[PDB]
What we know:
2 copies of one chain form a homodimer. Chain A is an all-alpha fold. Chain A has helices at about 5-20, 40-55, 55-70, 85-100, 100-115, 120-125, 130-150.
Amino acid sequence: ADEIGDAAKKLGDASYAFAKEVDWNNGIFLQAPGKLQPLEALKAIDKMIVMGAAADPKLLKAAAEAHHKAIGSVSGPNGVTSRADWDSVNAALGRVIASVPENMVMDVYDSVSKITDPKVPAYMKSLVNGADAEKAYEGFLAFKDVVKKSQ
Amino acid sequence: ADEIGDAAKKLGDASYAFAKEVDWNNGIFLQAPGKLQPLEALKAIDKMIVMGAAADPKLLKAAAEAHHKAIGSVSGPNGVTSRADWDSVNAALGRVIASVPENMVMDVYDSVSKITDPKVPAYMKSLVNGADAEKAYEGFLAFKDVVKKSQ
Ligand code: CHL
Ligand code: CHL
Ligand SMILES: CCCCCCCCCCCCCCCCCC(=O)OC[C@H](CO[C@@H]1O[C@H](CO[C@H]2O[C@H](CO)[C@H](O)[C@H](O)[C@H]2O)[C@H](O)[C@H](O)[C@H]1O)OC(=O)CCCCCCCCCCCCCCCCC
Ligand SMILES: CCCCCCCCCCCCCCCCCC(=O)OC[C@H](CO[C@@H]1O[C@H](CO[C@H]2O[C@H](CO)[C@H](O)[C@H](O)[C@H]2O)[C@H](O)[C@H](O)[C@H]1O)OC(=O)CCCCCCCCCCCCCCCCC
Ligand SMILES: CC(=O)O[C@H]1CC(C)(C)C(=C=C/C(C)=C/C=C/C=C/C=C(C)/C=C2C=C(/C=C/[C@@]34O[C@]3(C)C[C@@H](O)CC4(C)C)C(=O)O/2)[C@](C)(O)C1
Ligand SMILES: CC(=O)O[C@H]1CC(C)(C)C(=C=C/C(C)=C/C=C/C=C/C=C(C)/C=C2C=C(/C=C/[C@@]34O[C@]3(C)C[C@@H](O)CC4(C)C)C(=O)O/2)[C@](C)(O)C1
Ligand SMILES: CC(=O)O[C@H]1CC(C)(C)C(=C=C/C(C)=C/C=C/C=C/C=C(C)/C=C2C=C(/C=C/[C@@]34O[C@]3(C)C[C@@H](O)CC4(C)C)C(=O)O/2)[C@](C)(O)C1
Ligand SMILES: CC(=O)O[C@H]1CC(C)(C)C(=C=C/C(C)=C/C=C/C=C/C=C(C)/C=C2C=C(/C=C/[C@@]34O[C@]3(C)C[C@@H](O)CC4(C)C)C(=O)O/2)[C@](C)(O)C1
Ligand SMILES: CC(=O)O[C@H]1CC(C)(C)C(=C=C/C(C)=C/C=C/C=C/C=C(C)/C=C2C=C(/C=C/[C@@]34O[C@]3(C)C[C@@H](O)CC4(C)C)C(=O)O/2)[C@](C)(O)C1
Ligand SMILES: CC(=O)O[C@H]1CC(C)(C)C(=C=C/C(C)=C/C=C/C=C/C=C(C)/C=C2C=C(/C=C/[C@@]34O[C@]3(C)C[C@@H](O)CC4(C)C)C(=O)O/2)[C@](C)(O)C1
Ligand SMILES: CC(=O)O[C@H]1CC(C)(C)C(=C=C/C(C)=C/C=C/C=C/C=C(C)/C=C2C=C(/C=C/[C@@]34O[C@]3(C)C[C@@H](O)CC4(C)C)C(=O)O/2)[C@](C)(O)C1
Ligand SMILES: CC(=O)O[C@H]1CC(C)(C)C(=C=C/C(C)=C/C=C/C=C/C=C(C)/C=C2C=C(/C=C/[C@@]34O[C@]3(C)C[C@@H](O)CC4(C)C)C(=O)O/2)[C@](C)(O)C1
Ligand SMILES: [Cl-]
Ligand SMILES: [Cl-]
Ligand SMILES: [Cl-]
Ligand SMILES: [Cl-]
Ligand SMILES: [K+]
Ligand SMILES: [K+]
Ligand code: NA
Ligand code: NA
């Protein structure tokens, strides 16, 4: 057990209602988030590859395992995993983020933002309960503060 | 140095002319290869996650590093990496494939095939030199025999 695991449980309280409202079977997620821009996207994918090579290999292993278990507990019409697996996944991802330098994480966020159309967040939010999405995000902000403290 | 590295060099002789003919900047690769079928695709993605968790963590690390280096040497109008980086990537991927049980690799191939429209290989091949694609594939068959012997 660790502090990221404790923080993932609080994050789940704040975010699982949002998770249940996303339609994870929507084909939209395979689309570019705006105009397809292969050269810019490749730069973002490169920042991710750099980060994956920097990440602790045992923690990437554990984060993959957690996703395989989450897939096994999917149910209902939106394809949402169990509450327990939602928290497990978030904690395992938090540990991966904490295993690399902060600049590597920001480089991914910046490089993806560059290819992401300004309308995309609002359109995503419009398909769920707005208050639940806001509560999820304030949850994320509290969680990332625990993650940073392990980083 | 190892036998997979030697085999990757022969594979490059057989396949790099094909690599140069693919338009890696074509947006088509972001499309589902046929009808989008999220439940079946998730099963294929699950076989991959299982395989990634089973793979040797040092070899997955090295395979990511090899891709970051390959991205740095991209040139020309099709976005093709250098011959040296093409071989490096193939050897590092060969080592990853050899680090997991054969059944895990076949499970991915079967689960992806299930969502892949029968027209897709021929359409892909139609955008390149057919003889070069055939020479690439016969190269692959020789390479996978070396990979299997390390497996
Ligand atoms: C079928 C498998 C599968 C699916 C469908 C997804 C889906 C996703 N992954 Mg995951 N992953 C999957 C397998 C795996 N992933 C990962 C490792 C990662 C990493 C390292 C990351 C992702 C992230 C993401 C998200 C990227 C898009 C995004 O940011 O949306 C928005 C995100 C959500 C809807 C997820 C919940 C986030 C938050 C706790 C609550 C919601 C807050 C806000 C309302 C919206 C988000 C705001 C931003 C600024 C944080 C997306 C939800 C990324 C992500 O979520 O970025 C924030 C991310 O950083 N995945 C591994 C390797 C261990 C997997 C397999 O093993
Ligand atoms: C920008 C980054 C990036 C891009 C564009 C790609 C693109 C691709 N990856 Mg790669 N990857 C990338 C980063 C990374 N990959 C991987 C790990 C993997 C793995 C483990 C595998 C792929 C494979 C593939 C291919 C999947 C589709 C396919 O099978 O087409 C057809 C494939 C090609 C055109 C590639 C050349 C194959 C062969 C040597 C020559 C051509 C033979 C035939 C003519 C066509 C293929 C026949 C099939 C039956 C083998 C595709 C070419 C898969 C693959 O190639 O399956 C065969 C695969 O197994 N990637 C990692 C983690 C280390 C990456 C980042 O770090
Ligand atoms: C070949 C196939 C390969 C596939 C490759 C696929 C990967 C790339 C696919 C792209 C997917 C991107 C779409 C993501 C949208 C989700 C982000 C979002 O809604 O974000 C919403 C935010 C909203 O903006 C924020 O809005 C906030 C509002 O807060 C206010 O309001 C809050 C609650 O309402 C609180 O009150 C809070 O305290 C208060 O300040 C603040 O103003 C912040 O400053 C501001 O950042 O937008 C922002 O961040 C702007 C930046 C958004 C850019 C995207 C960021 C995602 C980075 C994640 C990296 C993952 C990469 C994707 C793939 C990885 C999978 C492994
Ligand atoms: C949210 C975003 C997340 C993104 C997720 C994305 C991943 C999934 C995206 C799907 C991409 C799939 C499209 C791939 C097409 C390439 C395969 C192909 O052209 O294949 C061509 C072959 C042609 O068929 C073969 O044709 C051969 C012909 O050989 C003959 O001819 C030869 C030379 O002409 C030689 O002479 C040879 O000796 C002689 O026998 C033989 O008959 C073989 O038995 C027969 O298999 O088709 C076959 O195999 C049929 C099976 C094809 C199924 C696809 C196989 C790919 C499996 C790779 C796993 C990678 C998964 C993809 C993503 C992974 C990235 C990490
Ligand atoms: C081989 C293999 O398994 O690889 C594995 C690799 C990983 C990394 C482990 C993995 C993973 C995680 C991944 C890829 C996550 C990807 C997330 C993608 C999110 C995409 C989104 C939000 C896309 C869009 C597109 C939208 C378009 C919106 C608009 O166009 C619309 C409607 C109309 C316009 O008028 C206005 C508009 C509003 C602009 C939008 O609103 O959102 C996975 C899945 O496991 C597969
Ligand atoms: C060896 C091997 O196999 O590697 C493989 C391993 C993987 C994992 C499968 C793999 C992969 C994918 C990877 C690395 C994905 C990485 C994702 C990174 C996500 C980062 C995020 C969300 C960062 C942020 C930063 C944010 C900042 C927000 C704020 O600053 C803002 C704006 C304003 C301030 O006022 C307050 C603030 C709130 C602070 C934010 O909100 O989010 C890959 C590439 O395939 C390689
Ligand atoms: C088709 C289908 O059914 O798919 C199903 C597939 C599944 C897997 C079963 C499934 C599921 C679950 C899923 C997808 C869960 C996704 C979770 C994503 C979690 C992401 C996390 C936590 C990302 C971050 C990024 C962080 C960055 C933090 C920092 O940068 C920040 C901000 C500010 C810096 O100053 C400091 C910092 C510390 C660097 C962080 O702290 O955390 C579901 C729902 O069932 C759908
Ligand atoms: C070949 C093939 O078929 O592969 C298949 C493989 C799969 C895995 C099966 C597959 C899949 C599934 C995938 C990747 C699913 C990804 C889901 C990502 C979902 C993202 C969502 C919800 C994003 C948001 C962002 C939002 C932002 C809200 C806010 O910012 C807003 C507006 C205002 C801020 O002030 C406050 C805020 C509240 C922060 C929100 O509310 O939500 C797919 C697509 O089927 C393809
Ligand atoms: C966060 C992050 O970085 O994730 C990283 C995760 C990884 C795994 C490391 C990674 C990687 C590798 C990946 C995903 C490789 C994906 C390969 C996809 C190949 C897709 C293909 C061939 C798609 C199609 C679609 C086609 C459609 C054809 C047709 O419809 C057409 C024309 C008209 C119809 O009449 C007939 C038809 C003929 C049916 C086709 O012919 O082909 C990457 C890139 O690094 C990103
Ligand atoms: C911890 C962590 O981070 O994990 C992350 C790590 C990654 C790597 C980034 C990641 C990923 C992606 C993964 C695993 C991709 C795996 C790809 C597997 C490819 C397998 C292939 C091509 C298999 C085959 C089998 C074939 C057989 C052909 C033949 O039998 C046939 C028909 C007919 C016979 O007569 C002759 C024959 C010729 C023998 C073939 O032709 O091809 C993931 C999911 O994101 C997790
Ligand atoms: C937009 C843009 O510009 O992107 C650029 C991005 C880059 C990265 C810079 C770039 C590049 C290079 C790329 C993509 C290279 C891709 C290489 C893929 C290699 C895949 C390999 C070897 C897969 C396998 C699968 C195998 C399976 C083998 C077996 O199953 C078989 C058969 C039969 C079983 O009985 C035994 C077995 C042993 C189990 C194997 O042996 O090998 C490029 C071109 O520049 C494009
Ligand atoms: C959000 C966002 O924008 O992300 C962006 C991220 C990126 C990385 C920048 C990006 C990208 C690039 C990607 C994934 C590229 C993937 C390329 C895969 C190419 C596959 C090809 C060529 C497949 C084939 C299959 C063929 C088969 C030929 C044969 O079988 C045939 C007929 C007959 C057999 O008898 C013999 C045979 C000879 C075997 C062939 O000849 O070729 C993209 C798309 O821009 C999206
Ligand atoms: Cl505890
Ligand atoms: Cl571009
Ligand atoms: Cl040698
Ligand atoms: Cl389906
Ligand atoms: K509101
Ligand atoms: K021919
Ligand atoms: Na470690
Ligand atoms: Na090892």
